[PDB]
Each structure stands twice: as C-alpha cells, then as structure tokens.
Design a protein around this ligand. Structure first.
Ligand SMILES: [Ca+2]
Ligand SMILES: [Mg+2]
Length: 430
DNA sequence: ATTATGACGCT
DNA sequence: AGCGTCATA
C-alpha cells in the first residue's frame, strides 16, 4: 500500500560511447568517417580479429569476434584500422586515453562510476534537484530533449522514425505534473535534459557520439541505453516497467546473461523478466540463494538499489597475451621473454598511473593457462610488488609459476603455456 | 585460433 | 587467498 517501496528514489544514467574504438580511429583518420569500418587486432591469422564495428558495417552483418577475412566476405568494401602493436602484443593505450577524455567531461556534471573503458554510470539525483529549483515550476520543452526516446510511447488512440520519437515525447510531456518537485517522472525528465547536455558536451569537446539510458537505477539505465542506438538516449520510467518486462527475455538483464539467467529460465520454466513477479521472495531465494533471490524479486518489479560507486579510475592495471594453437610457449627462454614484454608494458602504465593519480600498486598477480585446460585461467598466484621495475616483476612472476613446469628438463616447458597475465592491484595513496 | 582487458562473488 | 562468473572494446 502506502508502505510499498517503488524504487523511484534516485535518478541514474548510463552513458555509453557508440562503437567506441571505431570512433577513436575515425577521429584520427577522417578517411574512415561515415564508412563501414572495423577495428581489428593482429592480422596474420585470417586478417585479424574484429573488436569493434561501425554501424554502417553492422548493416552488412559484420560483428565483433569475426575474423576480418570473413567480415570481408559479408562486406567487401569494409575498411579496417589495426590496434597498435608494442613489445610483440596489442596495446590499447590510445583507447584508454580517449576514455579518460570522456570520463573527465562526464565528471563535470556528476559523480561517475567507470563501468568499462567506454561507459559510466551517473548518479543525477542531486543535479536534478538543483535544476528543478532553477526551473521554478516552469514546463520542460520538447526542444530540450532533441535526441530522447520515451520507452513505451507513443501509445493508444506518422510512419517515420523521428516522427514516432516526437509523438512519444509529446505524450510524455503532455502528461507531466511539473508543479510537483517530487514526482519521479518529472525527476527522470529533468535527468534526461541534463544527459542531453552531457552528451552535447562530450561530442563538442571530443568528437565522439554516445547513447544513454535514464532511469531510477543502474540496471534499468543500462537496459534503456541499448533500446535506441546509436547517438540517442532513452528514458525508462517506473511506469514503463510492466509492459517492457512482459516480453523482455531474461538474458537481457545485466548479470542474467550467463549461467544464473539460464538456470532461472530452466528451473522456473519462464522466458521473460516480468514472469518473475509471480514468485514469492522466499521461492526465489530457495532456488537462487538469499542475495540473488531478493535481488530478482525487486528487479522484476523495476527495483534495484546498487549505488553508483564514486570511482572514475580502474582498480587494477593488467597486461595479458594469449599464445594459441601452435604458438604456445614451450621453452623457458620463451616464457621468460614474454613475461618481460608484459612486465615492460605494465611498468610503463604503472609509472604513468603513479604520476597522474597519486597511488602505488602493492600486489602483483600472475596467471597462466596451460595447453588443454578448458578454463580461461589455469592458475593464479600473487606476490609482493615493491618496485616499478619490469625486470624485477618478470623475475618475480617466473618464480611464482616456475613450478608449474612438468618437464623433467629445465630448458623445456610442458605443458606449453597458452596465456600469460600480469596484473597490478591493491593500490595505496602516494 | 577471439583477444585484452576489468569488477565482484564464493568459500 | 585462489577460483569462478559476468561483462565490455
Ligand atoms: Ca559502447
Ligand atoms: Mg560499453
């Protein structure tokens, strides 16, 4: 009744750069702009592996994870940009630096949580209150929301995309109660005005475009963001939830895309998020555990309480390289040489991190995969990280893994190694 | 022979 | 701690 929480206490946005690595390359090379293009890493094996795809290329069916040779079969005029190679491996520095550009702009508007290289959650609750005070009961013009979609509208009693967008928006604004500074729908609307402003600033100052979701929590924000891409933003209101979830496959919800989501579907015999409402919280907790059960019970009603964490910097800095099929490392000299390459990239990134961010990593995590193991990682071991020195780190890493060598010969490595990983963690202020 | 990342949960 | 899950370019 009057005591039933509705999860409308916050305004949260998720901003996500459109085909990010592609835009980075297109900014640098104007010849790639407005073309079907992709970003690829390496090149020898089947033309390279695609990691990002422009919307023009996606129309031909080009996807992430596709080999470039195969992509060219779908899209013969596909243009490509290659990821930089340093010390024998892919080097993502250019994209990490572009990311900082965007995050520093978003941080001017609100506290952000860096969710990935190209997305951040924004807690707009306080900013919306402020903006609402400046507004003085004054209505919000459709003009302040030029790229906004209202999920669920238009409805009820134009055949062009942009025209539908506007019809929906008009219905929404026609129905807003603006004299009420606590209306959740109004709050979301003002949130969308601010995100329009954030997105304009990002584009003006970087050249990069993005999409965004505006809702009452991170999960709905994230879902909303993907509803209208690219270069658009979507408002998912509390009210839109029942209809949106009634046909929303469970795997679409963040955290439900893997094994848990599959078990929810299998155990409960349902397909869609909204079907979850028919189970009690205790039923859900019985199948999926106490925490997941409570989470699912609230989430299928559009309610979620995870905070936007005040964190703009990554918590770890890592370097990894796969050594697939025949290239697997089978000698001690090999393993040592590659540990050094990885350690050298890591030292470089750690030193920059210390100068920029006033912190020092204190733990080195070492991880390898051995040929045969189905798991991505076969073994993880940590040691102390007392000095930013690549020779030291690679030596320490070899020490912690050197006994994974089954070989009776000192110089041979069996089973061969198909992945090496160095990660610096546990930062302290400096 | 996707690859290179990065966060957080479990015991 | 070391392992597994889930996610993104
Ligand atoms: Ca993106
Ligand atoms: Mg993303």
């Amino acid at each position: 009744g009057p005591h039933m929480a509705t999860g409308q206490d916050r305004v949260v946005a998720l901003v996500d750069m459109d085909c990010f690595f592609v835009q980075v390359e297109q900014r640098q090379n104007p010849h790639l702009r407005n073309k079907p293009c992709a970003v690829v890493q390496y090149k020898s094996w089947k033309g390279g592996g695609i990691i990002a795809v422009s919307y023009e290329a996606r129309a031909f069916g080009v996807t992430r994870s596709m080999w470039a040779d195969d992509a060219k079969k779908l899209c013969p005029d596909l243009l490509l940009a290659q990821v930089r190679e340093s010390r024998g491996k892919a080097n993502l520095t250019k994209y990490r630096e572009a990311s900082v550009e965007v995050m520093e702009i978003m941080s001017r508007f609100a506290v952000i949580e860096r969710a990935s290289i190209d997305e951040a959650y924004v807690d707009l609750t306080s900013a919306v209150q402020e903006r609402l005070q400046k507004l003085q009961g004054q209505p919000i013009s459709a003009d302040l929301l030029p790229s906004t979609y209202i999920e669920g509208l238009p409805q009820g009693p134009t055949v062009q995309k942009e025209g539908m967008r506007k019809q929906g928006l008009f219905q929404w604004l026609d129905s807003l109660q603006i004299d009420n500074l606590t209306s959740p729908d109004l709050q979301l609307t003002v949130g969308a005005v601010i995100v329009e402003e954030m997105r304009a600033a990002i584009e003006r100052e970087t050249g990069f475009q993005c999409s965004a979701g505006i809702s009452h929590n991170k999960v709905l924000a994230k879902l909303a963001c993907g509803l209208n891409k690219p270069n658009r933003q979507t408002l998912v209101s509390h009210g839109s939830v029942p209809q949106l979830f009634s046909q929303m496959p469970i795997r679409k919800i963040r955290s439900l895309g893997g094994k848990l989501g599959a078990s929810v579907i299998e155990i409960l015999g349902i397909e869609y998020m909204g079907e979850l409402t028919q189970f009690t919280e205790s039923q859900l907790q019985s199948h999926f555990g106490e925490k997941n059960g409570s989470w699912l019970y609230a989430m299928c009603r559009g309610i979620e309480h995870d905070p936007v964490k005040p964190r703009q910097l990554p918590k770890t800095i890592g370097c990894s390289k796969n050594f697939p099929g025949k290239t697997a490392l089978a000698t001690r000299e090999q393993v040592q040489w590659w540990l050094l390459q990885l350690a050298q990239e890591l030292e470089e990134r750690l030193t920059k991190d210390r100068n920029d961010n006033d912190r020092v990593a204190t733990q080195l995590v070492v991880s390898i995969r051995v040929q045969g193991d189905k798991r991505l990682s076969s073994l993880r071991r940590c040691c102390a990280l007392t000095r930013y020195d690549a020779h030291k780190m690679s030596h320490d890493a070899f020490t912690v893994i050197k006994n994974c060598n089954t070989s009776g010969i000192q110089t041979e490595w069996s089973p061969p190694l198909t992945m090496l990983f160095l990660c610096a963690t546990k930062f302290s202020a400096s």
